Amino acid sequence: AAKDVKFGNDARVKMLRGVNVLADAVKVTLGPKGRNVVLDKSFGAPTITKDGVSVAREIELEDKFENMGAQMVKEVASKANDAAGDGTTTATVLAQAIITEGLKAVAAGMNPMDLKRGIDKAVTAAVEELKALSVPCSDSKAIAQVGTISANSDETVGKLIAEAMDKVGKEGVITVEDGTGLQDELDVVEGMQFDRGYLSPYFINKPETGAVELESPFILLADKKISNIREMLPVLEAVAKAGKPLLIIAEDVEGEALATLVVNTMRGIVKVAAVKAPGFGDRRKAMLQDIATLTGGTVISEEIGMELEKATLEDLGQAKRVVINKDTTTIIDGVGEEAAIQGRVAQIRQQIEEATSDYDREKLQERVAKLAGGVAVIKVGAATEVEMKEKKARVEDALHATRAAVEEGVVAGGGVALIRVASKLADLRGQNEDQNVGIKVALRAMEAPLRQIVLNCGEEPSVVANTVKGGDGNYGYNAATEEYGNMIDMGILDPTKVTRSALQYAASVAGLMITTECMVTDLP
Amino acid sequence: AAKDVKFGNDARVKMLRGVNVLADAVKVTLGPKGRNVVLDKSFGAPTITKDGVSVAREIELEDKFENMGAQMVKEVASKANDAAGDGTTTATVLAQAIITEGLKAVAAGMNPMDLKRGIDKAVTAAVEELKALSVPCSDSKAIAQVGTISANSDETVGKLIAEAMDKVGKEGVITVEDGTGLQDELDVVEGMQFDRGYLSPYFINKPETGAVELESPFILLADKKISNIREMLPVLEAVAKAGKPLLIIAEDVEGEALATLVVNTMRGIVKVAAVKAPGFGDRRKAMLQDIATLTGGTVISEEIGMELEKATLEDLGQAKRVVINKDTTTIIDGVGEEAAIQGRVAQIRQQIEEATSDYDREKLQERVAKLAGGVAVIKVGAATEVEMKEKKARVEDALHATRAAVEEGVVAGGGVALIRVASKLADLRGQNEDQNVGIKVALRAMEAPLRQIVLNCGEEPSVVANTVKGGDGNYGYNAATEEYGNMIDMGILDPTKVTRSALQYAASVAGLMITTECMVTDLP
Amino acid sequence: AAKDVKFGNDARVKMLRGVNVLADAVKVTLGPKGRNVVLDKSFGAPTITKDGVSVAREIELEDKFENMGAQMVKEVASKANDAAGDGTTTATVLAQAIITEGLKAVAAGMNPMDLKRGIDKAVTAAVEELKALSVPCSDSKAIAQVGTISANSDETVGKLIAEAMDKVGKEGVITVEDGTGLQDELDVVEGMQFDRGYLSPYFINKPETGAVELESPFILLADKKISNIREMLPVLEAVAKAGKPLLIIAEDVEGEALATLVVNTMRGIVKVAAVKAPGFGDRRKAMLQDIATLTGGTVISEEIGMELEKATLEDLGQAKRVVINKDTTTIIDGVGEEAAIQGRVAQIRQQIEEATSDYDREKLQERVAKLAGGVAVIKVGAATEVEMKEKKARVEDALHATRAAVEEGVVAGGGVALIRVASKLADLRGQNEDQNVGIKVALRAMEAPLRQIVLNCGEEPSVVANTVKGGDGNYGYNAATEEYGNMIDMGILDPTKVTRSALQYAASVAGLMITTECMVTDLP
Amino acid sequence: GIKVALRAMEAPLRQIVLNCGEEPSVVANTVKGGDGNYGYNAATEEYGNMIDMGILDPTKVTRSALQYAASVAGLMITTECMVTDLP
Ligand SMILES: Nc1ncnc2c1ncn2[C@@H]1O[C@H](COP(=O)(O)OP(=O)(O)O)[C@@H](O)[C@H]1O
Ligand SMILES: Nc1ncnc2c1ncn2[C@@H]1O[C@H](COP(=O)(O)OP(=O)(O)O)[C@@H](O)[C@H]1O
């Protein structure tokens, strides 16, 4: 509406303070010695977390100019989380050091626009160095180590995650849920399973819980619900002839079908139970072909060349057995050929490489794992609900970190990789002196993540940093153990992607931010 | 809306004060000499309670940082109540001692994360120690003592509760209601009974108040309302031929069926009364099978290939007698075999262990006890509603305490068990000194519940503790009689579960709380 | 309701200050060394921009009289942006110099109406000089230079845009969208394409992702949607007789027509499917004739003398092949005479030349590019969301700058064109002295854009101005390299249209503003 | 109390370095690494034997300063109450 305007240094100073407030809050949660930050909620209970992205979202400042600086730095932490789900706190630290030094350079009389370019080119060069340093992380011990390091140095977290990734496979789906006990527990689901139970409670086969176990059953898929649509007798009768159980997947099954069905099942004529498809028409219809092909069956195209009666017994899918409860249906193993299993998976590859990425990929891969791999769920122990969210959150960070480490490798932790690369880029130069200073400023900022970790440990950041620089390769300081050695051998590893993303996201916002001459905001 | 941020010691001090305010409110109500807390309600007259959880829920501080501290400690008291329904005041005290000592350790210059690990390791060991100490409470005398101790040393409450648990059984359901008199009274329900009156007021078998007693009745169950679908008479007529009374359970019965029924019943041709099912769709339908199986009858499943007319006299269940009134229907005993009763109970086991837990188990166990055991209701006598709430509240706490004592045994009271276990753990060490101090801090905090009890009695908390520590096993100080002796022999018992839960819940929040470096809250 | 009135100098001073506030905020972003402006909003994330128009739109002042001045100057920046999309910051600067000097003239005892006439006369003469100075930009290198200069001396932007304009042609359409990747990308579309996908997913000719390729298809256009209006069989059969694929464009196609169509396409009867028309009746109907004429087909005018069945195979248009996916339909090349492609284009000239220009031209030219030229889409890379809009914003400025440069030619950059033309007009005299001063003032103001650029550089604007005036023709100062030379040789180019528009738009509003004797506004 | 007194000792060295515009934490760490009279001379920005270089304090002044500092400190540590004239 109405504006308050500041020029040059006055605008940058206020912006810097906003950045410092946001960043200082974020910094205390960086490292094994990192300490928790509590966010005030008026909803039910306060939240205490060591996750940098969560803290950044929450922070808004009373001073409009300072707030604007903080709001812009908020995004780098936000973007880092979006990319790999970890290193958000580290990214914020880099933004803090780049911005502070860059503004200082601007004060010196240098053109910030040139400074951005220096920084941006330095960043591009730094990224290439990170890729060189990055080494594959395919073994279980290394995966555990990244999980352990990511989840505030918890060895158990990394170990459990490593087992999960190993058992489910490369494309498997891993999730984390609240645990009943104080103990961390891993659950693995083998085969094809979904969240819909049986409409006919009455047909219970052996176990209670409403469990339905059909042995060598035929699977029926349809695009229409069945009411008085019981007319499918030659199809069901054919099944009746073989004396085999029938499993039905469709939009819905009505009381008429179930009433007659229950008696047929109860007298032993046919053991048949029906369960509703996954949900939305786009959702269930897409998911039907895979169940059909997996079981060797044929999907009934209601809207096309098929009808309720029209379909021979061979069109039905076959499975060893199924498990049905009120809320869930499990197929033990449908009998289908590998060419069909892979073919269903192969058509999925286009689906995998999708521009949408959010929503489409998450659900779609779940089908993929289920079709040929497996799905794993991790339970987290903790006496209280608040302890539980912190513990679970860190575990998720480790889960994301392992995913990042596998796909793009790992680099030495403790901030050593950024400080080590900075020495390498010492010879980088640009078009003019202002750019050269910008390049140098970016390198200078690289050091900061290392020293924050040490600072949070209540130890002199400068002492540790000087000895670390003096060292070679992966040599660095272990904050937790309070001693010096090879970071990789100690099991402290940062996934390369989070490290890279942190530096690129920090620099990207920082470069433009340092170039701000004029700030525009509302008056009180 | 901007946020207020505090760092380190300033945040921890404010947090501590919030904790102290909440804890001080709770502490005064701890022990035989515990004092009352009055909660102001604009609803009606103010409430007076000695229950710590009730007091904890109410407390919220003007200062946002202090409030945040209190809200976090509020949860330990709240969680304890949810778990066992007692020891909430004791749990809060442990949080008070743990946090005060822990923050002080942080002040010294130690990693809070390490202190928390020390505390957690000590807690895990403490819990295990409690299980060893826990002496089984399988007799009525011990149960009475735990009830009496829970009820702020009210002997009548404890004895009454023991009789209730004894009479109903292990899976029996015990509830407490406000009495219409000044005297405490126990009510026990035998056989199968439900909260539904009779549709036809007109037919009363003999006793007044709508009391219907059918002698050797046949019981009919249905999934249908009856209006102009009276055609079922061949079934009714068959019963008329028999000369036996008919009991009817269905979704509803209307005047056409009721009006014909009334005259047939009025002049003695048939003695038949109809009552509506338990309540909600699958809740009532779920409960129909047990009624019919218990009585040896068959449920007419509309939903299953059966019909209203289709049912023989033999299908109907048989009972010695039933009792009905305007709001209640009771069956003295159905003729059903034990293997079928157990089969119904066995199938209930899945129902027993379920994710829903809250409310589902409460209603589900009601069916369970009703099916083979008994249901007990306790009335509390008080002239005034305010006196009644305090008296009744303590009774419920005692009821929960007995349930906890039966399930997990008991430990010596007066906080002696926690202080006694602490001596055992004096030999517990972690990876480093910071953890060792955390361990030591937890052990130190164990003593506090004992001393708070003594403190409330106007006696030196430290001296009593020193003499109690010098004792063996269950030796301790009895606050009520002001002298030392064997706590178990004096009838002071703490259910193991409440003691265990108190320590675990208190420590879990306390550990996280001491690790707080930054607190964020809204501006004043 | 009530009004505040100010007279003479006080009114002008408040107006001037309002102008100065707006202009000072805008000036900071002018030049290679220009600096960013950050805008705060309650909707999403704060904006960082170097675009003067974006900054101008936001600014509104607390003082009603100052606001009135700022609002009037806001329009010159806005109008310039709307006219050419670039030079908005420079235009604002001219308004600043014109008004400052003009007001000074007002304070000199001069008639403002005459001063305005002098300004207007000087501007008319200046424009003609600009017309003479402009040299056509026809080579790729020069276009790249204008794009690069507009994009704040970013070489990649100029390179990418130069390739695009050359490839799409003069009437082709170039747009910019946010890119998925970090790097900038260019997409070029050949032939005729539209944004509506296929109704039948089942219909995939060969490649996956819903990709359909029909070889030598017959194209059908209709003004109706097919539900149960299935009959068109003799039309369909004729295509079947031919053995060629059929493409259908209409308001809609239903499942009944699609279901039979799917079966028809699978076995081998016909390879045929339909895609929905562009959108609104006038947009789709107006766009139907061109697709039919392009392919040599006839649009079925349900409205006119044509109906469903009434139309043989020859009526249908032809194309070499089409590309169909979920979101788009592409015609590779329709077979039609150029006597008709041009005819569709020729009627378009009235369509191209009209008052609406916004909405109408974008969509209409889009058709034009598709009909005879090419369409290019540019994707913008950036690590972060804030970087992405700044990068993208500048790219649009370059896109518009290149469009302006090709249409009207280019002039030397750095503001040298205006300073050089001012010397030329040094002998222009009006009716009287007051006008002569007004003229002289406009010439004086021309110099300012050059010096503002130098001022942001951290160098003395006056020293550069004196040296540049002393020089000849295109001689000027390069802010980026800090040295003098030939601006054209350097590659610093100003499209004539942005330069001309800036000067005329600034002057038009400025002349009126200096004329003010009294200002009326609401009370504070 | 012991730790408080031992690290309190560091303050004058660090103060010297701080005044000079040098990092006290860095200088002190290296000086600790050395032995005897070895240390950093703020005036010349060099490390070695401070006494040989030309920087030293009498033992009596160093001792007296340290003991007086501790003596006054202990009195403040033990001071429960203060009494003064109104503002
Ligand atoms: N025990 C440790 N010793 C040395 N460095 C560590 C240790 N644990 C973690 N780090 C490092 O410090 C970084 C930040 O820790 P973290 O809180 O997880 O931040 P993110 O939240 O990961 O920025 C890690 O990415 C890693 O390089
Ligand atoms: N007469 C007593 N003598 C010694 N200890 C007692 C006596 N009565 C109760 N206690 C103890 O003090 C604790 C707290 O009493 P209570 O008010 O019931 O708190 P909860 O509400 O149980 O925290 C008991 O759990 C028990 O161990």
Ligand SMILES: Nc1ncnc2c1ncn2[C@@H]1O[C@H](COP(=O)(O)OP(=O)(O)O)[C@@H](O)[C@H]1O
């Ligand atoms: N590197 C440069 N050296 C000299 N002059 C430049 C340079 N870059 C841009 N200019 C000039 O200064 C003007 C303003 O730059 P710009 O920020 O793009 O403003 P607009 O936003 O174009 O007013 C340009 O139109 C051009 O004439």
Ligand SMILES: [Mg+2]
């Ligand atoms: Mg991490």
Ligand SMILES: [Mg+2]
């Ligand atoms: Mg109690």
Ligand SMILES: [Mg+2]
């Ligand atoms: Mg521009």
